[PDB]
Each structure stands twice: as C-alpha cells, then as structure tokens.
Amino acid sequence: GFRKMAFPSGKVEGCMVQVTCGTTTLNGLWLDDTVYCPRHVICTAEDMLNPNYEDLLIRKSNHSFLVQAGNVQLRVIGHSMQNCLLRLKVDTSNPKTPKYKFVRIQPGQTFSVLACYNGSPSGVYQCAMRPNHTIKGSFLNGSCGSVGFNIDYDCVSFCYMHHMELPTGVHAGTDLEGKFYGPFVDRQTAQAAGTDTTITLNVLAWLYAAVINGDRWFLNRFTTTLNDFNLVAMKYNYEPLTQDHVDILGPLSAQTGIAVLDMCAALKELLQNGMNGRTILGSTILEDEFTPFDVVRQ
Amino acid sequence: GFRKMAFPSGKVEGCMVQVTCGTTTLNGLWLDDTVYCPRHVICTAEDMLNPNYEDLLIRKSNHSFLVQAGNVQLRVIGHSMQNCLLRLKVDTSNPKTPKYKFVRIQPGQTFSVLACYNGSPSGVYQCAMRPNHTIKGSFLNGSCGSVGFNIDYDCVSFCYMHHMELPTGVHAGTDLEGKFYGPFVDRQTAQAAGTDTTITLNVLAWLYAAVINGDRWFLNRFTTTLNDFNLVAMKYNYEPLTQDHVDILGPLSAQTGIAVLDMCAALKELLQNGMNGRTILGSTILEDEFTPFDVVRQ
Numbered sequence: 019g020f021r022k023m024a025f026p027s028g029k030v031e032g033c034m035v036q037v038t039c040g041t042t043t044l045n046g047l048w049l050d051d052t053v054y055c056p057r058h059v060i061c062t063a064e065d066m067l068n069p070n071y072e073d074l075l076i077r078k079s080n081h082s083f084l085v086q087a088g089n090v091q092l093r094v095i096g097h098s099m100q101n102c103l104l105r106l107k108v109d110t111s112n113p114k115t116p117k118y119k120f121v122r123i124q125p126g127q128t129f130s131v132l133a134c135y136n137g138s139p140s141g142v143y144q145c146a147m148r149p150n151h152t153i154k155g156s157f158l159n160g161s162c163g164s165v166g167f168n169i170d171y172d173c174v175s176f177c178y179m180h181h182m183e184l185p186t187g188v189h190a191g192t193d194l195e196g197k198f199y200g201p202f203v204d205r206q207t208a209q210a211a212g213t214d215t216t217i218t219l220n221v222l223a224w225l226y227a228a229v230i231n232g233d234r235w236f237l238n239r240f241t242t243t244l245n246d247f248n249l250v251a252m253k254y255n256y257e258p259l260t261q262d263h264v265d266i267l268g269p270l271s272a273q274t275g276i277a278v279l280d281m282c283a284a285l286k287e288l289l290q291n292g293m294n295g296r297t298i299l300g301s302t303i304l305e306d307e308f309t310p311f312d313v314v315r316q
Numbered sequence: 317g318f319r320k321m322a323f324p325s326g327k328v329e330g331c332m333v334q335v336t337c338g339t340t341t342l343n344g345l346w347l348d349d350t351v352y353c354p355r356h357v358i359c360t361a362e363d364m365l366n367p368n369y370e371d372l373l374i375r376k377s378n379h380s381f382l383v384q385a386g387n388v389q390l391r392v393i394g395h396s397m398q399n400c401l402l403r404l405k406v407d408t409s410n411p412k413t414p415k416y417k418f419v420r421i422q423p424g425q426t427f428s429v430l431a432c433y434n435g436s437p438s439g440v441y442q443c444a445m446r447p448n449h450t451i452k453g454s455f456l457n458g459s460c461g462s463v464g465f466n467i468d469y470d471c472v473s474f475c476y477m478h479h480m481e482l483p484t485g486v487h488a489g490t491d492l493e494g495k496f497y498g499p500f501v502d503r504q505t506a507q508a509a510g511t512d513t514t515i516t517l518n519v520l521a522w523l524y525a526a527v528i529n530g531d532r533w534f535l536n537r538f539t540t541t542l543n544d545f546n547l548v549a550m551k552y553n554y555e556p557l558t559q560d561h562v563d564i565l566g567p568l569s570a571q572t573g574i575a576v577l578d579m580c581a582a583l584k585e586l587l588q589n590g591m592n593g594r595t596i597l598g599s600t601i602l603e604d605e606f607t608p609f610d611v612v613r614q
Contacts, residue, residue: 026439026440139324187317303599
C-alpha cells in the first residue's frame with residue numbers, strides 16, 4: 019500500500035543521447051545545444067591510474083565525438099571540460115528540453131534515476147544519497163551517464179550523473195556541474211567510501227507513514243530526551259537527530275498525533291529489542307530512503 | 317543492489333488524459349482517436365450500488381463526456397461500451413500514440429504502473445499480478461483509469477487499468493478489453509479478495525539472487541521430486557510449480573550451479589522450519605514479486 023515511487027521519467031527520457039569516443043560509448047544528457055557526459059568517455063584503458071584529462075582532451079577535436087540522439091547523429095561544434103564532465107556543443111537544440119535546473123543534493127535526500135544503456139532508457143527507480151556520499155543503486159554495464167533527478171512541478175531538477183561502481187558495489191557520481199559527491203575521483207583505482215550510517219530523519223518519517231497507514235504496533239507510552247535518544251543512536255550507527263530535524267517532522271507529528279520525541283522513544287525500543295518478526299509497512303527492516311517530503315506526497 | 321525497477325514511463329505519459337462525467341473525474345488512455353476509461357465514470361454515488369450500465373449509457377450523449385488532454389480539450393465524436401471499459405471516439409488522433417499491444421497479464425508476472433490523478437502523471441512503480449487476481453498497489457482517490465504496462469523494444473504492452481479498491485486494501489481492474497482480472501465486478505458489493513497464495517516461481521528466483529549475492533546458509537543436500545515439493549508448498553499456501561517454471565529457472569540454475577529441484581529442497585526446509593533467526597538478502601520474509609527475469613538482469 020505504501021511503496022517507493024519514482025517520478026515519471028518522460029521529461030528526462032527525451033534528453034538521453036549516446037556519446038561515443040573511439041571505442042567507448044556511454045550516455046549523455048542533451049539540454050538546449052549542449053550534451054553533458056562523463057569525461058572518462060575519452061579514456062580507453064588508461065583509466066587506471068594514469069589519466070591526465072587535460073592531456074587527453076587537448077588531443078581531441080569535435081570530430082572525435084560521435085553523438086547519436088536516437089537515429090539522428092548530432093554534429094559536435096565544440097567541446098570543453100567542467101570538473102569531471104565533458105560539455106559538447108551541438109548544432110541542434112533539443113526540442114524536448116524541459117524546464118530544468120542543476121542542483122546539488124545533500125546527504126539523506128532522495129531522487130529518481132533513469133538507468134540507460136547506450137542512449138536508450140531501460141528502467142527507473144527511486145534512491146537516496148547515502149550519508150557517505152555513495153548511492154546504493156542499480157548500474158549495469160553501459161550505465162555511465164545516466165542521471166538522477168527530482169521533478170516539481172513541471173521543472174526537472176537534475177542532481178546526479180553516474181560515473182563508476184566502487185569495490186563494495188555501491189555507486190559514485192557527480193552533480194551536473196561535474197563535481198563528485200564524496201571523496202572519489204574518476205580513475206580506475208581502488209577507492210573506499212567512509213563508513214556509512216542510517217538516515218535517522220528518514221526512519222522517523224517512515225515510522226509516521228506506518229502510523230498514517232494504520233500500523234501502530236511499535237508505538238508505546240514512553241518518551242525520551244533529544245540527547246537521551248541520540249545516545250542510543252550512536253550505539254546503533256544512526257546519525258544524530260538535530261533540533262531542526264525535529265522541526266521538519268513537525269507537520270507529520272501533528273497529523274499523526276505523536277510528538278516527535280515520542281516517536282523517538284518508539285524507535286529507541288525498536289532498535290533495542292528488534293522487531294521480533296513483525297513488519298512495519300510490509301518491511302522487516304527500518305527503511306531509511308523515504309524523506310519526510312516523500313511521506314507527505316503519499 | 318537488487319531493486320524493483322519500473323519501465324521508463326514517457327511513452328504512456330503522452331497517452332494519459334482526464335475524463336469527466338458530471339461530478340466524478342478519472343483518467344483515460346488516449347491511443348489514436350479513441351479514449352479508454354472505466355465505465356463507472358458514468359455512475360453516480362447512488363447508481364453505484366446496482367447500476368445497469370446499458371441503461372445509464374443510452375441516457376448519455378457525446379456532449380456529456382468532457383475529455384481534457386492537458387490544456388487542450390478533445391471533442392467526443394462517439395461512444396461505445398466494451399465490457400467494463402468505455403471507448404470514446406475523439407475529435408483528434410493522439411500524436412504521441414506509440415507502438416502498442418493489449419495483453420492479458422498472467423498471475424505472477426510483473427508490470428509497471430503509472431499512477432495518475434486528474435490526467436496528470438504522479439509516479440511510476442512496479443508490481444505483480446497476484447494469484448488471487450488482485451494487485452498490492454498504491455492508488456489514492458483519483459487514480460481510477462491509471463494503467464499498468466510493460467515495454468518490449470519500442471512497443472508498449474498495456475495490460476492493466478485500475479478500477480477499484482477492495483476492502484482488504486488491494487486493488488482490482490481490467491485488461492484493456494475491459495475484462496476484469498479475478499471474479500470482481502464494477503459495483504459496490506460485498507466482494508473481497510480470495511485467499512492469496514505466494515508466487516513460488518519468484519521466491520525461488522529470489523533465493524537464486526541471494527546465492528548470487530553471497531547468502532547461502534539455506535542450501536542443503538536433501539533432494540525432492542517436483543511432486544513432493546508441490547505437495548508441501550500447497551500446504552503452506554505456496555503456488556505449486558509447473559513444468560514451465562522449472563524451465564524458466566534454467567539460466568539461474570546453471571549460473572549458480574544449484575539444480576532447480578535442489579533449490580526446491582532448500583525452500584521446502586524454510587517452509588517447514590522457518591528462518592528464525594536468520595535473514596535472507598537482509599529480510600526475514602521471502603520476497604515474491606521479483607521475477608527470474610528481474611534477477612537475470614544483474
């Protein structure tokens with residue numbers, strides 16, 4: 019009854035193109051007369067750990083970039099680098115360009131990903147930016163260049179473009195200015211993310227969704243202090259709850275009738291005693307990739 | 317990184333319209349010069365207890381049907397009834413109509429839903445046709461007429477149109493020929509979903525996925541015949557396996573080196589002994605809406 023939903027992807031699908039340099043092909047994002055794609059499309063197998071991108075790019079011309087928008091080929095009439103993205107200027111302006119902006123999301127926030135394979139969309143799913151700046155997503159081969167985004171109301175906010183999979187199987191990428199999220203670099207060398215944590219604000223939002231969905235089994239009559247709950251949080255690898263966090267859940271506390279600190283006492287008990295085989299909103303695990311705004315939307 | 321993924325929704329988004337009849341509005345599907353929507357749009361609250369749809373329809377003219385495609389209004393040139401759908405002949409032929417088919421989905425197979433409200437797409441999610449012919453979906457007030465679909469190559473196989481929420485929280489509707497899935501009817505009556513069973517085909521796929529991911533505490537060396545597995549499964553309200561299911565699991569069997577019937581003997585043990593305390597892919601309940609096809613993609 020309550021499930022992860024992704025935004026409708028039509029407005030993004032109309033921007034997906036195929037960019038080929040030499041023997042490497044990945045996805046690009048075509049907005050106005052610019053194609054954005056990861057720069058390592060110029061890198062053959064020098065991706066590790068040698069790539070000098072300035073050095074590899076000076077040796078390229080517009081001719082060395084083949085860009086396909088479906089069947090049509092677009093003529094590249096310029097190119098430049100911005101952080102870890104290539105910007106390819108093309109002669110045609112995308113007639114399907116939606117209203118859009120480039121935003122850098124903060125950890126804990128969610129977005130939809132349109133997974134693409136050589137310019138063609140393939141699936142769409144919801145995910146979140148982990149506190150350690152990775153995303154636990156689904157990016158197969160040929161997925162580089164796929165974008166993450168949020169929509170509201172007719173405006174697409176792009177927040178992520180995919181670059182690489184890490185040893186642990188999680189994913190690393192940039193905003194649409196080409197700056198990585200996290201400590202990572204676009205080079206085929208071993209790279210660790212920091213130790214991840216659970217997004218406490220999202221677990222609480224999701225506990226409200228259960229109550230709002232008629233699932234109260236975990237509630238109790240107790241209450242706890244902010245610091246008293248944060249003590250349990252550190253012992254359980256949850257990130258500390260700030261007071262402004264409590265204020266974000268203000269609307270949900272009023273609709274639910276449970277004060278935020280009461281929900282925290284409930285969460286405290288769930289963390290200490292487990293769930294003993296029952297379910298919350300059909301899940302056996304404390305879900306932390308729904309934001310408060312996500313929960314209000316459904 | 318095993319996530320439920322929906323097909324990209326753009327090809328369906330450009331077909332979603334708003335059908336209004338008196339006081340009640342819902343969604344319709346606009347392909348070529350016909351708009352498809354549930355016939356209960358013509359019912360009033362009073363008429364919904366025991367409607368005579370042929371009676372209620374002759375008492376209506378083309379000019380009773382307000383059909384809006386975004387800003388533009390479309391003029392209803394004609395109207396007929398196909399089972400529990402209305403087919404509205406429209407002024408204009410949808411310029412965004414894609415290659416499409418109307419298919420009847422089988423229990424256990426999955427599709428994507430584009431959840432819509434007043435003709436405006438809101439979100440995309442993936443779900444399964446349950447054995448009891450309902451779907452566990454996310455439909456709020458205004459979602460009637462929202463469609464479910466799969467995309468193969470460039471062709472949209474429409475398979476579902478949402479009609480009703482049952483008392484137990486799950487949902488019922490029709491194919492795009494207006495034939496209901498299950499024994500349900502489009503009247504307010506005492507109907508309720510029959511006993512649901514678990515999609516064994518998909519549980520086994522999920523177990524293979526778990527093995528591929530390094531979870532294999534549940535494998536054993538006992539063996540089972542197809543017949544003896546099926547006798548145990550049915551006693552636990554699991555669907556019995558068909559000859560075709562065994563073949564559908566071929567690829568995953570070879571990829572893992574675990575014979576289909578050996579994975580059946582693993583499941584048989586989980587059914588009879590339970591899992592407590594152990595987890596599988598992080599969960600203590602066996603997932604049954606991930607298909608062998610979903611697993612094979614990763």
